[PDB]
Amino acid sequence: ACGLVASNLNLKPGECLRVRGEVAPDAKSFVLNLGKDSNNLCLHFNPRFNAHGDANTIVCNSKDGGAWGTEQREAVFPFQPGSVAEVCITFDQANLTVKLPDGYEFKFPNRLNLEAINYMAADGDFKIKCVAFD
Amino acid sequence: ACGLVASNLNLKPGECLRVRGEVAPDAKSFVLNLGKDSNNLCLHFNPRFNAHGDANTIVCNSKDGGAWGTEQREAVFPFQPGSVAEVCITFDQANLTVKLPDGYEFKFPNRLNLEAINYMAADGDFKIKCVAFD
Ligand SMILES: OC[C@H]1O[C@@H](S[C@@H]2O[C@H](CO)[C@H](O)[C@H](n3cc(-c4ccsc4)nn3)[C@H]2O)[C@H](O)[C@@H](n2cc(-c3ccsc3)nn2)[C@H]1O
Ligand SMILES: OC[C@H]1O[C@@H](S[C@@H]2O[C@H](CO)[C@H](O)[C@H](n3cc(-c4ccsc4)nn3)[C@H]2O)[C@H](O)[C@@H](n2cc(-c3ccsc3)nn2)[C@H]1O
| Structural domain spans, chain A | 1-134
Please state, in angstroms and rounded to a whole number, the distance separating the CA atoms of residues B118 and B45.
16
What method did the depositors use to determine the structure? X-ray
Residue nearest to atom 7 of ligand 2 (CA): B52
Q: Looking at this protein, which amino acid is placed at residue A91?
A: F
Q: What is the resolution in angstroms? A: 2.2
Task: Give me the torsion for CA of B127, B132, B133, B134, rounded to 10°.
Answer: -140
Closest listed ligand to the CA of A126: 1
Is the CB of A8 inside 8 Å of chain B's CB atoms? yes
Q: What share of chain B is helix, strand, coil (3-state, %, to 5)?
A: 0, 65, 35
- Residue A130 per-residue DSSP state: E
Q: How many angstroms separate the CA atoms of A8 and B122, rounded?
A: 10
Report the Cα–Cα distance between both ends of chain A, in Å, rounded: 27
A1-134 CATH: 2.60.120.200
Residue nearest atom 26 of ligand 2, based on CA coordinates: B52
CA distances from A73 to A35, A42, A48, A53 (A): 19, 16, 10, 13
Give the distance from CA B68 to its chain's centroid.
15
B37 has a chain A CB within 8 A of its CB:
no
In whole angstroms, what is the distance from residue B130 CA to residue B134 CA?
13
